[PDB]
Every structure is written in C-alpha cells, then in structure tokens.
Structure 1
Amino acid sequence: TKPLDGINVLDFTHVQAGPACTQMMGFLGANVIKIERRGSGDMTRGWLQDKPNVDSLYFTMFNCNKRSIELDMKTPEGKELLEQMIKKADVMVENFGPGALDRMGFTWEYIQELNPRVILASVKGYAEGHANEHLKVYENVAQCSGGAAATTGFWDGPPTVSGAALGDSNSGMHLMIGILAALEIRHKTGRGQKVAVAMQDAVLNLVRIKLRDQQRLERTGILAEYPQAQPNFAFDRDGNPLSFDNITSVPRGGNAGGGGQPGWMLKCKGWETDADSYVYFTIAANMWPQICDMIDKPEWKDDPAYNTFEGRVDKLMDIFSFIETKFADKDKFEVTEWAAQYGIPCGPVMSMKELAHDPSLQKVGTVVEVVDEIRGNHLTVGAPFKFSGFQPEITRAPLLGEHTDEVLKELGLDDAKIKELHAKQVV
C-alpha cells in the first residue's frame, strides 16, 4: 500500500542533503520525526524567506511529510528522551559533520546496544578514512571535489557549477538507496547497519562517464568526439587553437553529447529575447538518413564525409551550425514536434516558469500543489518514482516544535512530565 508505512525515522538532518532524503522517505509513507534545535531549528527556515516570520520555501519544499520536535541534546533529560526514541526508530538519519553524534554520547556502538535493529545513516563531505574526511563541504564545494565542475561549462571558460543539486539532493537520494538496502538486509539478519554517503562520491558516481573519458585519454591521447578534436574549432581566450596535443585531463566540452551520442544546444526563434529558447538536438549514428531528409540534404546520405561517426568528426560543429539554421524561425516546441515526426531525439530547454505551470507534470504527480492553510499553498517536486500500487499523499511541512507534545505522548509521558521539560528548556 505504501512501501515505508510503519518505518519510523528519527531525523536529525538539516539543510538540503539529509532532509531531501527524509522527505522522500516521508513521501513513500515513513513516519519521520525531525529533531530540531530549540529556538531556531533547521537553518533553512530563515533562509531566503519570501514573507517575513514565515518558514521559507527552502524549508517547506524539503520538509513536507514530517513532524517537528525541538530538543536540546546537551541536557541529561534530552539524552534520556533520545534513548527512548532510538528504541522505537527503524532508521536514524544524520548530516551533522564528523564525530558530532559520538560527542553527544551516541556512538554507533551504544546505539547498537540501545536498538540492535536500528539503521544509522549519514551524509558527510568525504568518506570515512579519506585524507579530507574533516573538510567542510556545501553543494558547490562537493561538485568541485567530485569532478563535475572541471567537466562542466566551456573550454574557454571556468569550471562551472551545475544548477542541479549534484551534491546535496543527489547525496540525499544516494543515501536513500543505502537506507533501503540496509532495510532489505535486516529482513535476513535481524540487525541494523551503519551506512554513509559522501557528497564527493555521490558526485563522482554521476560523473563516472568522465572517468571513462580520463582513461580513454590516458591510453589513446585523444577523445575524437569532443569539440577540441575537430581541427581549428576550439580556441582558448587568446585566439590560440586547441587540440588534444596538450590535454592530459578531461576538458570541458561545452554542450557536447557526453554519454548521449553526439549533440548540441541549438538556438530557436527568440533566443536574443529569451534565455531558454533553445533545443537539444542529437545525431544518433543510426539516424543519419532521417536527419538528412529533415534538413533537406539528400547528398549527405551517401557521401562518406557525412554518413558514419568517423567522417562526421572532421566537421561536427559545421553540421550543427547548419541544422541550427533551420530552427531559426520556429520556437522550441515547433522544432521538437517537427523532430518527433522523424523519431530524432530532440527536445526543448524547459524554463522553470514553464515547468512550474506545466499541466503534464501536475497530472502525473511530479510537480505538486501542497495544501498549506497556514503559509499559503505552494508547489513542490513529488516522487519521481511512479508505482502501480500506490500514490504519495504529500502534506505540509511542520512548524517549529509543532508536534513536540504529540510526540512525547506517543513515547508515554504524562502531561506534567511534558510541562517540566518545556520549563527546563529541554524542549
């Protein structure tokens, strides 16, 4: 009915990486109890707010399907409460930076003694045992540490950060694989495990195709399909030409295909006026004829300077310029619909405005209107996994300490034991 119904998650996480993971577990039915610092709670609450003294969108789009309890974990009575909650939890999730939980008294070793069944899941910057184990890491630092930044953007520009959250949310989703894997192993052992994802490794996993390319480069000295391998196409900022004579580490390739077969980002009508008025167009080698028909170049079906991967390298960027020319007069949608007639893989650059209001994404539950009576409704990204046997029921993100008392009742605490704790500045 819902894969994580009845899994309870003691969630210590803050910001993006850890909360993204617990939220998505929440969307699959887990009972996520989020533990927050007394007074402020999760930073994201006060970051980039749109209305004052209202939880930010940063917070709400990463914290639906959870309850909040405030807790000072430095206090004798808070540690006592934690022990009870650990005994009821299936997974504890944390992204606190190294040794921190151990310093609260909750080493993996003691946790095992409190609940041999509980899984301990962590996000960190670097793996345990890495020389950089101790370094401090946010989204873009991890994109840098993991290879994305070096391999993204252009040959004549800097390393470029990706808009997508290659380091926070992607670590989050990786962690969520770890957690589920550990739940799968517990069915056979009766025991919990420790599991950790490092932002660098999560990034690296997504840039695995670039570690393909580094080895290709080391062994052959060239990467035929990169723009720098087309003679006198690519120039550094001083007008000097670029080739694989000089390159010993995988370079930026602009809008080249990557793991996609050859491709490029082509202008559509209005690109001067509209930043996102562009398609991506792919030359699959198996599609050469189809493409010649579309662009009205029958002469290129048989010329061997044009009809194999190999002949095409001499000229790839000239081909792409010539295709661009046909799109000169059509918006990205006309171009995608035209391309689709030929089966060619080609699609528009969707702007975020287009995405936030697309009827298709709301039909399938991928953009979702969350009903929030307190802060006002708001959009969010649902579950990118679709299942035959159930639908996520997303509900609004918790207010600070909203559920503190309700959670203490589920633990078995009389109403005056709760009164004590508020006054003691534990909760």
Structure 2
Amino acid sequence: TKPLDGINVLDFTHVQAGPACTQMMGFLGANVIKIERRGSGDMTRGQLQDKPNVDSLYFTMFNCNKRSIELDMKTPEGKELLEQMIKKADVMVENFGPGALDRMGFTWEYIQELNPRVILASVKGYAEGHANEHLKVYENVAQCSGGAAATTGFWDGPPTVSGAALGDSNSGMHLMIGILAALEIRHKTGRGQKVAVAMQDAVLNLVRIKLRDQQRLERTGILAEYPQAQPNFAFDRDGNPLSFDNITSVPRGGNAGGGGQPGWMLKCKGWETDADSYVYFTIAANMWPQICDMIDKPEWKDDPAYNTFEGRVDKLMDIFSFIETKFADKDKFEVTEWAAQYGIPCGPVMSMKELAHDPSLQKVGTVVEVVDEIRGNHLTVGAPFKFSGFQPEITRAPLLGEHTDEVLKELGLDDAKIKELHAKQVV
C-alpha cells in the first residue's frame, strides 16, 4: 500500500504550484481528479509545446497520476456536480485568485456544511491579511517578494532569479506539508481544516539563512564569511569599493557558501567552451590540514594567517583563486574524485543533459521514464522521498476531459444524465 491510497483529491489547480502539489500526492497514491475548464483546460497544455497539438512537457511533467474531467463551473449543473464531488473528497486544492472560490459559490463555511471532513488547501501569492494579499504573483515575482532575488547573484550585478522554482514548485511542496498535517489532525478531530501557503512565505522559509544574516549585519556590522568582508576585494560596476562599512541589507555574495561552510565555484578544464565545467569547493574550518596537503601548501598548516576561519577572512578569495589553478588540467569529475580522496566536500556542476541521462538517477527512481503511448515517452522527476515500504508508480498525464464519463459514473450518474450534461455543455 501507498501513503495516500484512498485519499480523494478534488483538484482545481493549474499552472505549476498547485499541480506540483497534487501530482506528488498522486505519486504517493492519492486519487487525483483534475477539474479543468471545459474546452481549454490547464494553460500549461499549450505552453511551449515541442510538437504541434500535443500537450506540452510543461503539462505532462506536472500532471502525471491524475484524471481529467471537463466542467463548466459557471452553470447550475456544474455547481451541483461540484457539491457531489466535494462530498466524496478528502482534499480540495486550488490556486485561483483570492475570493475566486467564494464567488463560485463555495465559501469555506459552505464547504464544511457539505463535508465536515474535507480539507481546503490553497496556494496564494501573499498571505491572507498581508497588505498585498490581493496581488497576482508568478514564479520570479515570488522570488523577488521573498528575498531570494535580492540575495542571489553578484554584488556588481542585478538581483537574479533562481533556475529552481522557488516560487511555484516550492510553494506546492509546502502546501503538501500543510495538507498532510491537516490529515494528521483529522485523525484526532474527525474534521477538515483550511490550509494555505503564500508563495512569498515559501520563498522566505528557504531564505531563513538570509534573515539570520540580516540580523547579524544589524547587530555586528559585518558578515565575515561574505566576499565583501575581504578588504579591497569586491567592487561595483563603477569601481567603487563594496565593504560592510556601508552595507545595511544582506548583499549578493556571488558563489559564497550560504548556510554551508565557506566555498566557491571553481573552473575546471574546458570552462571556456563548456558552461558547466566547474566544481563547488568548500573550505571547512576543521579540514584545513587536508586542504593544505591537497594543494601542496604544508607551510599553511601551522600559520595563523591561514589556519583559522578568522585568519582567512582577509584572504579567502585569494586562496580560492590559488586552489582553482590546481584544476586547470582536470575535468569536474576528476577534480571531484580528487577532493573526495581528502574527504573535502566538493562536487560537480551537473548539466541538465548530464542529469537527464544519468543512470544513477534513473536507478533510484528520481528521474523516471513515463510510458505515454499517445505522446511518446518522456522523462519526469519522481518522488524525492524514498520509502522502505513502497515505490511510486508513475502513469501518463491525462488528455483534456479524458476521464469525464469515468468520473461521472463514479458519482453514480446513469448514462442518460451523462448524455444530457454533454448535450447541455456542462461537461
């Protein structure tokens, strides 16, 4: 058995955040019924298709392990169908605008009346009660709102967005925590709850380490592990020096260590013509003797200018520069294997091509080839949590309205009324 076997999810979600949540629930066994707007469905279907009139990879990689029903929710018959489905649901998931579901005729209070056991889960841009609770928020705007853009990139460059979906997929995974937590209390109370995750808040949770830094900066005036702490190292575009003398908000640290020990992104053989020929190399305070052996600087072992974190603050970027010279004739895997001999945390920048075809990720079920006879097989990311008792079974994303009749039959409707709903264009 799987964790969410027998959990019925009434899934209103579209785009990335909501759909990621419900897909992952589906991977863990949930019965996910995706309600799609009649005639068009989820906008991801037609976004950046790789083959004309075939559902895009955007759609398929976020909508496996779901069934699709088309529904016109503006009709009295549509609202009536939702009421019956709400009565069979364990969780309702949505990412409509604020109030949208109330305006559709389904307030939390009316939903509780229909089903006291149902959990209502929502993805929002900003938290309810926020000054911006009504603003529309998409991926990169959430990254900007939550502190990530401000603290990502370089001191002499702009705020920069992460390639990782810190806004969308991250909010969906956070909502899944919320939903699962609500299921856990329901075993105690026998009652459903409303749970909501704001995209700003999900981002902020991941930038907790930068709120640490903001407070440290306020309290002490310096962040010793940042490149800017090195005297005369960091400069802006115009050549003005950037030191903590005048920094009042956590700055961009380039490739600094963050919540890790100090580190940097170092070039390996081929970097000029291969964008991903780098390693991340860490200088852990308890590994200085090992590093010194590796780079043949035994004279740095007993020197206090080199052998403590504090001693290294004025020169750490120089040290990285020197270490980097040792990698000039080695590729990133050779360097990783070499550092690993020393027990030094160091690893390659994996290219997306490398990840897509990596046998290890397919062995452990993290990159999964989905069987799709209609569209052709494709890769997706599987469950990142591995369990002793089960494996997800990932099945292809649904065609638009593919399971409409199937779902209506399960609601106990006979063929006559199904015909009529189709005839009436409710479904």
TM-score by length of 2: 1.00
- Superposition deviation, residue 193 in structure 1: 0.1
- Superposition deviation, residue 262 in structure 1: 0.2
- Superposition deviation, residue 130 in structure 1: 0.2
Aligned partner of 1:196 in structure 2 is 196
Superposed CA deviations along residues 282-317 of structure 1, whole A, max 9, x for unmatched, are 001010001000000000000000000100001000
Distance 2:241 2:41 in 1: 54
Q: Secondary structure at the match of 2:130?
A: coil
Aligned partner of 2:101 in structure 1 is 101
Q: Secondary structure at the match of 1:69?
A: strand
Matched length:
427
- Superposition deviation, residue 239 in structure 1: 1.2
- Superposition deviation, residue 241 in structure 1: 1.3
- Superposition deviation, residue 248 in structure 1: 0.4
Q: Secondary structure at the match of 1:96?
A: coil
- Superposition deviation, residue 216 in structure 1: 0.3
Q: Does 1:147 align with 2:176?
A: no
Distance 2:321 2:251 in 1: 22
Q: Give 5+ residue unaligned stretches, structure 1.
A: none
- Superposition deviation, residue 423 in structure 1: 1.1
Distance 1:124 1:70 in 2: 24
- Superposition deviation, residue 78 in structure 1: 0.5
Distance 2:343 2:227 in 1: 25
Distance 1:240 1:58 in 2: 43
Superposed CA deviations along residues 62-91 of structure 1, whole A, max 9, x for unmatched, are 000000000010100011000000000000
Superposed, 1:157-168 pairs within 5 Å as 157-168=157-168
Q: Secondary structure at the match of 2:327?
A: helix
Q: Secondary structure at the match of 1:409?
A: helix
Q: Secondary structure at the match of 2:150?
A: coil
Distance 1:306 1:383 in 2: 43
Distance 2:314 2:377 in 1: 54
Superposed, 1:239-388 pairs within 5 Å as 239-388=239-388
Distance 2:289 2:192 in 1: 56
Superposed CA deviations along residues 36-87 of structure 1, whole A, max 9, x for unmatched, are 0001100000000000000000000000000000001010001100000000
Q: Secondary structure at the match of 1:320?
A: helix
Q: CA RMSD in A?
A: 0.4
Superposed CA deviations along residues 196-226 of structure 1, whole A, max 9, x for unmatched, are 0000000000000000000000011111111
- Superposition deviation, residue 380 in structure 1: 0.2
Superposed CA deviations along residues 371-392 of structure 1, whole A, max 9, x for unmatched, are 0000000000000000000000
- Superposition deviation, residue 152 in structure 1: 0.2
Distance 2:419 2:98 in 1: 34
Q: Secondary structure at the match of 1:327?
A: coil
Superposed CA deviations along residues 341-373 of structure 1, whole A, max 9, x for unmatched, are 000000000000000000000000000000000
Distance 2:314 2:87 in 1: 65
Aligned partner of 2:64 in structure 1 is 64
Superposed CA deviations along residues 145-194 of structure 1, whole A, max 9, x for unmatched, are 00000000000000000000000000000000000000000000000000
Distance 2:134 2:95 in 1: 13
Q: Secondary structure at the match of 2:312?
A: helix
Distance 2:48 2:301 in 1: 54
Q: Secondary structure at the match of 1:113?
A: helix
Distance 1:340 1:227 in 2: 25
Distance 1:48 1:294 in 2: 47
- Superposition deviation, residue 271 in structure 1: 0.4
Distance 2:224 2:365 in 1: 41
Q: Secondary structure at the match of 1:266?
A: strand
Distance 2:55 2:422 in 1: 22
Distance 1:136 1:207 in 2: 21
Q: Give 5+ residue unaligned stretches, structure 2.
A: none
Q: Secondary structure at the match of 1:328?
A: coil
Distance 2:339 2:180 in 1: 40
Q: Secondary structure at the match of 1:394?
A: coil
TM-score by length of 1: 1.00
Distance 2:332 2:97 in 1: 44
Aligned partner of 2:20 in structure 1 is 20
Distance 2:224 2:288 in 1: 18
Aligned partner of 2:390 in structure 1 is 390
Distance 2:165 2:54 in 1: 24
- Superposition deviation, residue 110 in structure 1: 0.2
Distance 1:247 1:341 in 2: 39
- Superposition deviation, residue 335 in structure 1: 0.3
Distance 1:50 1:399 in 2: 16
Distance 1:144 1:426 in 2: 40
Superposed, 1:45-194 pairs within 5 Å as 45-194=45-194
Superposed CA deviations along residues 223-275 of structure 1, whole A, max 9, x for unmatched, are 11111110100011011211011110000000000000100000000000100
Distance 2:247 2:235 in 1: 13
Q: Secondary structure at the match of 2:85?
A: helix
Q: Secondary structure at the match of 1:22?
A: helix
